[PDB]
Amino acid sequence: ACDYTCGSNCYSSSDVSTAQAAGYKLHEDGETVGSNSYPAKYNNYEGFDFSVSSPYYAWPILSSGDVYSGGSPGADRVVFNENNQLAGVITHTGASGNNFVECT
Ligand SMILES: Nc1nc2c(ncn2[C@@H]2O[C@H](CO)[C@@H](OP(=O)(O)O)[C@H]2O)c(=O)[nH]1
Ligand SMILES: [Ca+2]
């Protein structure tokens, strides 16, 4: 079963931890990759009910299993905070415009 389901993409907790670790590392080094400069600040316009405190940062999680290194970020993102705590997993899939919805 999927720990997180983003559209047709299935993710396990291990997939999320691996992606989060990569994104947090770049965050601590102040380095960014991709046209959207990930890891990027996530303002939570959607108003998701995250249990951990902000600031939040979004980092792409890929359905291929590989860690994001630039290029197309796809539609899914892992959101983490300054303490390297997981806030949630979100996606543009099934969301209007440039908004996000949570993966179930
Ligand atoms: N939907 C959404 N986009 C945000 C938020 N904070 C920052 N953004 C950024 O703003 C852009 C959308 O206006 C997003 O790019 P993306 O659409 O390429 O993912 C994303 O990087 C937020 O809270 N919600
Ligand atoms: Ca996987």
Swiss-Prot record:
Catalytic reactions of this protein: [RNA] containing guanosine + H2O = an [RNA fragment]-3'-guanosine-3'-phosphate + a 5'-hydroxy-ribonucleotide-3'-[RNA fragment]
GO molecular function annotations of the record: lyase activity; ribonuclease T1 activity; RNA binding; RNA endonuclease activity
EC number(s) from the headed UniProt entry: 4.6.1.24
Any GO CC annotation of this UniProt entry: cell septum
Keyword Lyase included in the entry's annotation: yes
Keywords: Disulfide bond, Endonuclease, Hydrolase, Lyase, Nuclease, Signal
Catalytic residues, chain numbering: 40, 58, 92
Disulphide bonds in the chain: 2-10, 6-103
Similarity comment: Belongs to the ribonuclease N1/T1 family.
Subunit structure and binding partners: Monomer.
Protein name (record): Guanyl-specific ribonuclease T1
Native organism: Aspergillus oryzae (strain ATCC 42149 / RIB 40)
Organism placement in taxonomy: Eukaryota, Fungi, Dikarya, Ascomycota, Pezizomycotina
Full-length numbering of the shown residues: 27 to 130 of 130
